[PDB]
Amino acid sequence: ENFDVDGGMDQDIFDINEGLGLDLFEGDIRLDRAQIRNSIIGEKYRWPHTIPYVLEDSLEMNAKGVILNAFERYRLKTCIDFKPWAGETNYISVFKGSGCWSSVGNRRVGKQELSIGANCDRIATVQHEFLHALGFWHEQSRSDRDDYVRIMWDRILSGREHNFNTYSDNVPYDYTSVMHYSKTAFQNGTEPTIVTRISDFEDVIGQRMDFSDSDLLKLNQLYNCSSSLSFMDSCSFELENVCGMIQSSGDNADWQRVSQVPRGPESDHSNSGFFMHFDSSSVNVGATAVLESRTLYPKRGFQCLQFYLYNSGSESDQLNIYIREYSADNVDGNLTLVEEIKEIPTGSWQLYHVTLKVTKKFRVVFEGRKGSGASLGGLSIDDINLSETRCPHHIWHIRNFTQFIGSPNGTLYSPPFYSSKGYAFQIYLNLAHVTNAGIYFHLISGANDDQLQWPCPWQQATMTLLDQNPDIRQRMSNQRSITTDPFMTTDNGNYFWDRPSKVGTVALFSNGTQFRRGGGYGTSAFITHERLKSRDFIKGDDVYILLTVEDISHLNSTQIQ
Amino acid sequence: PWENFDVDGGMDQDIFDINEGLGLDLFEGDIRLDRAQIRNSIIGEKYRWPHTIPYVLEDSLEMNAKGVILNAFERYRLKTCIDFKPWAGETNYISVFKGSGCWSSVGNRRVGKQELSIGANCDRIATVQHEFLHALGFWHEQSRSDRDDYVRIMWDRILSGREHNFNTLNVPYDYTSVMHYSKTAFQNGTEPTIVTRISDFEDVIGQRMDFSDSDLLKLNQLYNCSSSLSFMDSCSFELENVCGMIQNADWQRVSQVPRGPESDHSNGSGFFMHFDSSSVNVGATAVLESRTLYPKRGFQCLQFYLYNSGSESDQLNIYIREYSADNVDGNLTLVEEIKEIPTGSWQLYHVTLKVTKKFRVVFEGRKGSGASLGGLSIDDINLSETRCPHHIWHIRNFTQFIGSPNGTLYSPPFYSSKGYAFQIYLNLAHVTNAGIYFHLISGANDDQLQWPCPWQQATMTLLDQNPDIRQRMSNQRSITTDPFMTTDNGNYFWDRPSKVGTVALFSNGTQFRRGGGYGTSAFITHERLKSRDFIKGDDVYILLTVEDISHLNS
Ligand SMILES: *[C@@H]1O[C@H](CO)[C@@H](O[C@@H]2O[C@H](CO)[C@@H](O[C@@H]3O[C@H](CO[C@H]4O[C@H](CO[C@H]5O[C@H](CO)[C@@H](O)[C@H](O)[C@@H]5O[C@H]5O[C@H](CO)[C@@H](O)[C@H](O)[C@@H]5O)[C@@H](O)[C@H](O[C@H]5O[C@H](CO)[C@@H](O)[C@H](O)[C@@H]5O[C@H]5O[C@H](CO)[C@@H](O)[C@H](O)[C@@H]5O)[C@@H]4O)[C@@H](O)[C@H](O[C@H]4O[C@H](CO)[C@@H](O)[C@H](O)[C@@H]4O)[C@@H]3O)[C@H](O)[C@H]2NC(C)=O)[C@H](O)[C@H]1NC(C)=O
Ligand SMILES: *[C@@H]1O[C@H](CO)[C@@H](O[C@@H]2O[C@H](CO)[C@@H](O[C@@H]3O[C@H](CO[C@H]4O[C@H](CO[C@H]5O[C@H](CO)[C@@H](O)[C@H](O)[C@@H]5O[C@H]5O[C@H](CO)[C@@H](O)[C@H](O)[C@@H]5O)[C@@H](O)[C@H](O[C@H]5O[C@H](CO)[C@@H](O)[C@H](O)[C@@H]5O[C@H]5O[C@H](CO)[C@@H](O)[C@H](O)[C@@H]5O)[C@@H]4O)[C@@H](O)[C@H](O[C@H]4O[C@H](CO)[C@@H](O)[C@H](O)[C@@H]4O)[C@@H]3O)[C@H](O)[C@H]2NC(C)=O)[C@H](O)[C@H]1NC(C)=O
Ligand SMILES: *[C@@H]1O[C@H](CO[C@@H]2O[C@@H](C)[C@@H](O)[C@@H](O)[C@@H]2O)[C@@H](O[C@@H]2O[C@H](CO)[C@@H](O[C@@H]3O[C@H](CO[C@H]4O[C@H](CO)[C@@H](O)[C@H](O)[C@@H]4O)[C@@H](O)[C@H](O[C@H]4O[C@H](CO)[C@@H](O)[C@H](O)[C@@H]4O)[C@@H]3O)[C@H](O)[C@H]2NC(C)=O)[C@H](O[C@@H]2O[C@@H](C)[C@@H](O)[C@@H](O)[C@@H]2O)[C@H]1NC(C)=O
Ligand SMILES: *[C@@H]1O[C@H](CO[C@@H]2O[C@@H](C)[C@@H](O)[C@@H](O)[C@@H]2O)[C@@H](O[C@@H]2O[C@H](CO)[C@@H](O[C@@H]3O[C@H](CO)[C@@H](O)[C@H](O[C@H]4O[C@H](CO)[C@@H](O)[C@H](O)[C@@H]4O)[C@@H]3O)[C@H](O)[C@H]2NC(C)=O)[C@H](O[C@@H]2O[C@@H](C)[C@@H](O)[C@@H](O)[C@@H]2O)[C@H]1NC(C)=O
Numbered sequence A: 001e002n003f004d005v006d007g008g009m010d011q012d013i014f015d016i017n018e019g020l021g022l023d024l025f026e027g028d029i030r031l032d033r034a035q036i037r038n039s040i041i042g043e044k045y046r047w048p049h050t051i052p053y054v055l056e057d058s059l060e061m062n063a064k065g066v067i068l069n070a071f072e073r074y075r076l077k078t079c080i081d082f083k084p085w086a087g088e089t090n091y092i093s094v095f096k097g098s099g100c101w102s103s104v105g106n107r108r109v110g111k112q113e114l115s116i117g118a119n120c121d122r123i124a125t126v127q128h129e130f131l132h133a134l135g136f137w138h139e140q141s142r143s144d145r146d147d148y149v150r151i152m153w154d155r156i157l158s159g160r161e162h163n164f165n166t167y168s169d170n171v172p173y174d175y176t177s178v179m180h181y182s183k184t185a186f187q188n189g190t191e192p193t194i195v196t197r198i199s200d201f202e203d204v205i206g207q208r209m210d211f212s213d214s215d216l217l218k219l220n221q222l223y224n225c226s227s228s229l230s231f232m233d234s235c236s237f238e239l240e241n242v243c244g245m246i247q248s249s250g251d252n253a254d255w256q257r258v259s260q261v262p263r264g265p266e267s268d269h270s271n272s273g274f275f276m277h278f279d280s281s282s283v284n285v286g287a288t289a290v291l292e293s294r295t296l297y298p299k300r301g302f303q304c305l306q307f308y309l310y311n312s313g314s315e316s317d318q319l320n321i322y323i324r325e326y327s328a329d330n331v332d333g334n335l336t337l338v339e340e341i342k343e344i345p346t347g348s349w350q351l352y353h354v355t356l357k358v359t360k361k362f363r364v365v366f367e368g369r370k371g372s373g374a375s376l377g378g379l380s381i382d383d384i385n386l387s388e389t390r391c392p393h394h395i396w397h398i399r400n401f402t403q404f405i406g407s408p409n410g411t412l413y414s415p416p417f418y419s420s421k422g423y424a425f426q427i428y429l430n431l432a433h434v435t436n437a438g439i440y441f442h443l444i445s446g447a448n449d450d451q452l453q454w455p456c457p458w459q460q461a462t463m464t465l466l467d468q469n470p471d472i473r474q475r476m477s478n479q480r481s482i483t484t485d486p487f488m489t490t491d492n493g494n495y496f497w498d499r500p501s502k503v504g505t506v507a508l509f510s511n512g513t514q515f516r517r518g519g520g521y522g523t524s525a526f527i528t529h530e531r532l533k534s535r536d537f538i539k540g541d542d543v544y545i546l547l548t549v550e551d552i553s554h555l556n557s558t559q560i561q
Numbered sequence B: 001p002w003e004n005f006d007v008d009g010g011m012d013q014d015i016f017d018i019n020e021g022l023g024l025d026l027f028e029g030d031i032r033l034d035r036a037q038i039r040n041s042i043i044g045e046k047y048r049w050p051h052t053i054p055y056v057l058e059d060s061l062e063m064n065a066k067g068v069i070l071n072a073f074e075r076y077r078l079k080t081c082i083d084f085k086p087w088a089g090e091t092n093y094i095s096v097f098k099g100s101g102c103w104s105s106v107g108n109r110r111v112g113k114q115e116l117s118i119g120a121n122c123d124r125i126a127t128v129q130h131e132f133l134h135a136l137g138f139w140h141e142q143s144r145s146d147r148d149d150y151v152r153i154m155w156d157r158i159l160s161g162r163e164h165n166f167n168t169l170n171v172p173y174d175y176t177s178v179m180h181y182s183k184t185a186f187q188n189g190t191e192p193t194i195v196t197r198i199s200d201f202e203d204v205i206g207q208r209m210d211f212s213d214s215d216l217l218k219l220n221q222l223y224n225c226s227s228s229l230s231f232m233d234s235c236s237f238e239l240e241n242v243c244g245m246i247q248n249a250d251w252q253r254v255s256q257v258p259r260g261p262e263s264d265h266s267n268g269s270g271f272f273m274h275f276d277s278s279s280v281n282v283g284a285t286a287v288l289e290s291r292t293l294y295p296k297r298g299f300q301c302l303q304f305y306l307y308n309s310g311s312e313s314d315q316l317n318i319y320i321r322e323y324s325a326d327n328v329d330g331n332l333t334l335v336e337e338i339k340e341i342p343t344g345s346w347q348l349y350h351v352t353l354k355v356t357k358k359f360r361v362v363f364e365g366r367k368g369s370g371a372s373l374g375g376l377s378i379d380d381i382n383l384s385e386t387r388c389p390h391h392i393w394h395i396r397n398f399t400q401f402i403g404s405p406n407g408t409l410y411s412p413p414f415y416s417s418k419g420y421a422f423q424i425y426l427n428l429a430h431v432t433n434a435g436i437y438f439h440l441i442s443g444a445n446d447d448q449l450q451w452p453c454p455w456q457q458a459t460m461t462l463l464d465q466n467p468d469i470r471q472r473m474s475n476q477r478s479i480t481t482d483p484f485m486t487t488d489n490g491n492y493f494w495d496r497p498s499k500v501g502t503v504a505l506f507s508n509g510t511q512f513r514r515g516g517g518y519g520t521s522a523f524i525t526h527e528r529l530k531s532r533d534f535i536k537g538d539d540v541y542i543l544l545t546v547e548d549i550s551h552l553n554s
């Protein structure tokens, strides 16, 4: 009884628009009057660094949330920002048209339409359409494209051959571009229409996870970006000056930059390769050592500190996180304990997220502490990232992951979680299919159910398969969102998102306690197993699914200004 | 030996030692403060140069200094979007002249003619780079407000009246900045005035080889640089898309070859391209082409490392395919045939190009007549719009000579562009510093050459073998032959070696005459020589260019 938003298919932008018969340039580009196809966009047809926008009322509620999520990716990785339209002469009007499409560049026409239609509410689709708005074309149309890919003309659907035309017009050809067609673009049959000449990229082309490194380089070079709104720092200890961090102790303890520890880890997490290590084996009980960042300058007032930790020491050792915030009244700073990380499981790298709310210049202080008893190792930290973003609400850590890919036993249910509004939920990850991974959001019976609004109204669940790249700026995480529509009905006439005790099926927790699970809402095409096995989604055989469930009923109201 | 001339006079004097010794009393040793300019203040947009800086090299400059300054401009052209042009009447320009010491104002002071001094002993490329970073608006690194978290100031060790030289986006403190004091700055005695908190960097501060990566990031961010004038491409095959190079594939991306090499050069983890000539017929070829490149200058230097585990009969052909509006598919020209490649070691090659339109480099491996058990491998390809070195001195098994009595090395003989025969002397025997000297030697053209040797500038570069040309901090010094220079006995220093030189033997035992050596006893410290990639696979490369600079007398 699960609901698949993708209807048992894996349709890209180009499959959605083809199925509607839109006949746009290269499937999703709306050419302007006398605009030259695949031509250089001049300075006059560019947006300012901050783009005014309107999210029109025709947009689906899930689409509005997804678009705002896309803006947060631009704010982390570029110096492009977006602001609600306040009367500027030109702005982007995002609306529910037929299919997903955009003009290429700032056409200087005042209100400029960008369509995010039905089935276009995917963050990378939004990112792709806004790259068109910013002035970018597709990658496979480059004049040198035949040196990198082969077009299988006999496999293209009759009358769709013109979508592969090249014109007359530097960064290397980018197979990973979010602006590249997939190998199945306009195919007639089961055989690919685009074959990469380098066999390694056959299943890479057509990625729809995030911007590629080359997509970002081109955009950041165009807008002269030297910073972003929400990136703060990334440290993997790869250089001897360790990103300006300063280690100290009053206890004959220290943090050492090492490539290995005899008791563990045998190597860094980044994966020659270095990490910081607090030895607890040869210091006295209660000895501490602090590793302090250089001074950082926040622009937003909320932050997410994240890092990987390895414990080869004792159950009694701990890592304390402090913030030292500086203000005019106290130049030595105000030191505050923000997190105590205790009883760290031994023998594996583990990801931690710490929520911060610092508004003044500050330093992050990592304090390793030796606890009671004996130790043969210590605490190791690597891949520290800091951004002015919200921490995920919940994190589902799946260990020994690879054994489940394409396997009949690959039907995984997350631990139960409580959303911000108090709804209890569970995630279902289906890895049993031969080619695609599926992901579904379920409401479950919870302690607050008697006082909650039913059917569940406009909660947006964002599920992110983390790309565990050492640098937050280089992660191409695979993210999908769904929104609970309180008017959605089942085949039997009941409300899909009603109270699980009323419409749910019986299930058991790992401990054997019975509960009610509502219908699952999600997609059978979350990611292909081939892409799931690429980049750093799996690292040390661990997978992380980040989860945020929030009320988006405030997005219903007309955008006024 | 005794006939050599050390330009550094048995010392290793930095900018701050030169100016201190003259009693200039400038801000932080080499900054000329403007009227009511606030010390170490943020340089506003109004006090910045345009992307192209107009300049004049004044006649007071020493001939060697003029050549060194133009060499410094080439470093800016490769690593930044800053360029330099001869002044043609722009409102503000930099007047480079021989003043007392090395110094500059900080920023474009908008005063019209703005002086920058490159005085006696300042004719070092990194000194020029440092003074032009001041002109561009940069101060020194150790004056940063957080500097006490990274270094200790030994106040008791500073010369009286010099304490003022130490009292003070989001890039970490840079120990390797070309703008950082060395540990001996303004010292009174033999003890350091600046001591890094971390013992590692104690002798790293004060590097004067080239820009650091953080120096370049700050400058490139300030001028929104997305390209440079002379960088074209760098490929170490670290990614599967192999930097857009095009080619079953005849060149294979591998991490090892059974008959050699056991690993990549850049240093599975590392990768290189390999043509397995052993598995194909005689006459078979393998073609690897760069992506399309867009030149801005009319001259280029293509460089790469090659490893041959195949036969002496295998070869590598280099073609250029140049594209123009009229040509349907480009114009292919053979530019280089690399034959009889010595086997069993990575070797650096340089190829001179003169392309003016968009083009591709075409690498063609060819299987020769002899039986082969391996193939040809290529790694660390770099292309820039620069002049190739005239000669390269490749020193194998280098490490054994550092600090050793036997570390007195003489290069093979070379012929300069004007026909002068020369040899390089590298002295590694000192406990802390490496020395380098240029000698003229007897050669076949000596009867037809002008004597004493007039205004030939010899540029000697210790190559930092980083895989990426943009990240090399190569250590370079130049000297110029002054035909009026005399010896203690009254003879001309640069006269004909048969007349003023000493008897020497080549490796083969043939006798020749060697003139006096001219160079420095402080070319590089052994500590810095052992850092970065100066030594790689126990190989060292000294790049050599010897050219006539009498045209700079103007
Ligand atoms: C087999 O396995 C099963 C599955 O694992 C087991 O089942 C679980 O069993 C446990 C134990 O029996 C059970 O735990 C209980 O959970 C209760 C619900 O927890 C969530 O909700 C509350 C309340 O949320 C409402 O209020 C907040 C504001 O306070 C608001 O933000 C929410 O939106 C929400 O509002 C809505 O509802 C109210 C009515 O409730 C309406 O008035 C309102 O209008 C809205 O509609 C949250 O507070 C909880 O969050 C806290 O706790 C979690 C977990 O510890 C923390 O992660 C989280 O940060 C938060 O922390 C708070 O407390 C700490 C101090 O401890 C503070 O520092 C911090 O600032 C926060 O205030 C959850 O999201 C919960 O109420 C209940 O609590 C009772 O015990 C505690 C002691 O622990 C007392 O202090 C309380 O007074 C209560 O007496 C208790 O924890 C699980 O719910 C249950 N799970 C499921 C899925 O069924 C099973 O037991 C096992 N079987 C066996 C045999 O082993
Ligand atoms: C122990 O070890 C000792 C040390 O190694 C050995 O000593 C060496 O022994 C060899 C063999 O006996 C000896 O070789 C000879 O070298 C002669 C000099 O070579 C250099 O100079 C010439 C001439 O330069 C002048 O002319 C050019 C233009 O024509 C001009 O650009 C120059 O600036 C210069 O001008 C000035 O002088 C002239 C007068 O000469 C004035 O008229 C003028 O006004 C100026 O004042 C250069 O041509 C040479 O360069 C060519 O060769 C080198 C090496 O091969 C190349 O790297 C270089 O690119 C260039 O290549 C040329 O040929 C290729 C062919 O494919 C062309 O493509 C290219 O375009 C060039 O034309 C040197 O820089 C040299 O003249 C002489 O040549 C004769 O033999 C060859 C045989 O192949 C014939 O072809 C010629 O016609 C000649 O008959 C010969 O090569 C070394 O000089 C000697 N070294 C030293 C330091 O002493 C010792 O032998 C050994 N003992 C034992 C027992 O083993
Ligand atoms: C040194 O730093 C301390 C820690 O600062 C916090 O942490 C660091 C890491 C950064 O993230 C900072 O930005 C952050 O403030 C300062 O103490 C903190 O002060 C703030 C007020 O400035 C205070 O916040 C209030 O909290 C109450 C609720 O308090 C309970 O709950 C918190 C946890 O949430 C708990 O920590 C407390 O112990 C309490 O049990 C809340 O009602 C307040 O809301 C109201 O305030 C805003 C205006 O500020 C208003 O717009 C709202 O509408 C609303 O009415 C407010 O959020 C923190 O609780 C407190 N934290 C701690 C651990 O003490 C510290 O400040 C000094 O102490 C404060 C108690 C207060 O007397 C200040 O005036 C003092 O300066 C600071 N010390 C100095 C000398 O600068
Ligand atoms: C196809 O390419 C051929 C090879 O080009 C060269 O090599 C490639 C790798 C690349 O570096 C190119 O940039 C090189 O040009 C072309 O042949 C060459 O053409 C050039 C002229 O474009 C010839 O040159 C001259 O060489 C003389 C000595 O031999 C010099 O005296 C002369 O100097 C004068 O040059 C300029 C004006 O151009 C003045 O400003 C100077 O002050 C000076 O007086 C030139 O440098 C070169 O010799 C040719 N090489 C060969 C091997 O033929 C070829 O070009 C065609 O043929 C030449 C002969 C001319 O008729 C061209 O007009 C003609 O296009 C290319 N073919 C096509 C069709 O494009």
Ligand SMILES: *[C@@H]1O[C@H](CO[C@@H]2O[C@@H](C)[C@@H](O)[C@@H](O)[C@@H]2O)[C@@H](O[C@@H]2O[C@H](CO)[C@@H](O)[C@H](O)[C@H]2NC(C)=O)[C@H](O[C@@H]2O[C@@H](C)[C@@H](O)[C@@H](O)[C@@H]2O)[C@H]1NC(C)=O
Pocket (backbone or CB within 6 Å): B399, B400, B401, B404, B405, B406, B407
């Ligand atoms: C060049 O000199 C190197 C250093 O010589 C040693 O130190 C001097 C200060 C002096 O006391 C001298 O007597 C010493 O021998 C030689 O390398 C050293 O060789 C010794 C003995 O073979 C060896 O134990 C050391 O590890 C080694 N040191 C270093 C820093 O490499 C060079 O010798 C060559 O290398 C040897 C390993 C050996 O194969 C020998 O036959 C080689 O000649 C000297 N090189 C040359 C070309 O003479």
Ligand SMILES: *[C@@H]1O[C@H](CO)[C@@H](O[C@@H]2O[C@H](CO)[C@@H](O[C@@H]3O[C@H](CO)[C@@H](O)[C@H](O)[C@@H]3O)[C@H](O)[C@H]2NC(C)=O)[C@H](O)[C@H]1NC(C)=O
Pocket (backbone or CB within 6 Å): A156, A157, A158, A188, A189
């Ligand atoms: C999608 O692909 C299928 C399979 O290739 C296409 O169908 C095939 O189209 C060809 C067109 O030349 C047909 O061949 C011709 O058939 C006639 C008889 O019908 C014969 O007289 C000719 O000599 C020639 O063989 C082929 O029969 C047909 N096959 C099938 C199974 O239908 C289809 O047209 C493609 N669709 C699109 C939208 O591109």
Ligand SMILES: *[C@@H]1O[C@H](CO)[C@@H](O[C@@H]2O[C@H](CO)[C@@H](O[C@@H]3O[C@H](CO)[C@@H](O)[C@H](O)[C@@H]3O)[C@H](O)[C@H]2NC(C)=O)[C@H](O)[C@H]1NC(C)=O
Pocket (backbone or CB within 6 Å): A043, A222, A223, A224, B051, B223, B224, B225
């Ligand atoms: C990114 O930064 C670069 C500068 O580092 C900006 O480039 C500059 O763009 C302006 C036009 O916007 C060019 O202006 C020129 O002005 C003169 C008059 O002073 C006029 O004659 C020329 O026709 C031209 O308009 C300027 O040359 C150019 N500078 C360089 C070095 O390229 C670029 O605009 C910035 N990008 C964004 C999105 O802001």
Ligand SMILES: *[C@@H]1O[C@H](CO)[C@@H](O[C@@H]2O[C@H](CO)[C@@H](O)[C@H](O)[C@H]2NC(C)=O)[C@H](O)[C@H]1NC(C)=O
Pocket (backbone or CB within 6 Å): A049, A223, A224, A225, B045, B222, B223, B224
């Ligand atoms: C580098 O590019 C930025 C724009 O991307 C330029 O910054 C602008 O500078 C003007 C004044 O010259 C201001 O009015 C704008 O507000 C700036 N825009 C932003 C977004 O900062 C900067 O001037 C360029 N630098 C150089 C040297 O040309």
Ligand SMILES: *[C@@H]1O[C@H](CO)[C@@H](O)[C@H](O[C@@H]2O[C@@H](C)[C@@H](O)[C@@H](O)[C@@H]2O)[C@H]1NC(C)=O
Pocket (backbone or CB within 6 Å): A403, A404, A407, A408, A409, A410
């Ligand atoms: C899920 O299915 C796969 C494929 O059949 C199995 O490999 C997994 O088995 C687990 O791993 C093997 C190596 C062995 O240790 C076995 O005992 C494990 O169960 C299987 N996983 C689970 C959890 O059943």
Ligand SMILES: *[C@@H]1O[C@H](CO)[C@@H](O)[C@H](O[C@@H]2O[C@@H](C)[C@@H](O)[C@@H](O)[C@@H]2O)[C@H]1NC(C)=O
Pocket (backbone or CB within 6 Å): B396, B397
């Ligand atoms: C560098 O050291 C190695 C030993 O580790 C020597 O074998 C090299 O000698 C050279 O190569 C051998 C095979 C033989 O041809 C010999 O005559 C050579 O000298 C040595 N290389 C150099 C240049 O000294």
Ligand SMILES: *[C@@H]1O[C@H](CO)[C@@H](O)[C@H](O)[C@H]1NC(C)=O
Pocket (backbone or CB within 6 Å): A399, A400
């Ligand atoms: C993962 O695999 C190891 C064996 O390699 C096993 O000991 C461990 O319990 C497994 N973890 C989980 C969470 O299943």
Ligand SMILES: *[C@@H]1O[C@H](CO)[C@@H](O)[C@H](O)[C@H]1NC(C)=O
Pocket (backbone or CB within 6 Å): B158, B159, B160, B188, B189
């Ligand atoms: C240098 O140090 C000596 C010894 O302390 C001291 O007597 C002398 O005055 C100092 N000179 C200067 C110039 O500071």
Ligand SMILES: [Cl-]
Pocket (backbone or CB within 6 Å): A065, A066, A069, A122, A123, A462, A479, A480, A481
């Ligand atoms: Cl999303």
Ligand SMILES: [Cl-]
Pocket (backbone or CB within 6 Å): A234, A235, A236, A237, A238, A239, A243
């Ligand atoms: Cl790092």
Ligand SMILES: [Cl-]
Pocket (backbone or CB within 6 Å): B067, B068, B071, B124, B125, B459, B476, B477, B478
């Ligand atoms: Cl130089």
Ligand SMILES: [Cl-]
Pocket (backbone or CB within 6 Å): B049, B050, B091, B092, B108
């Ligand atoms: Cl100016």
Ligand SMILES: [Cl-]
Pocket (backbone or CB within 6 Å): B469, B472
């Ligand atoms: Cl180089």
Ligand code: NA
Pocket (backbone or CB within 6 Å): A236, A237, A238, A268, A269, A270, A271, A273, A274, A275, A382, A383
């Ligand atoms: Na690391």
Ligand code: NA
Pocket (backbone or CB within 6 Å): B236, B237, B238, B264, B265, B266, B267, B270, B271, B272, B379, B380
């Ligand atoms: Na390599």
Ligand SMILES: [Zn+2]
Pocket (backbone or CB within 6 Å): A028, A029, A128, A132, A138
């Ligand atoms: Zn598109």
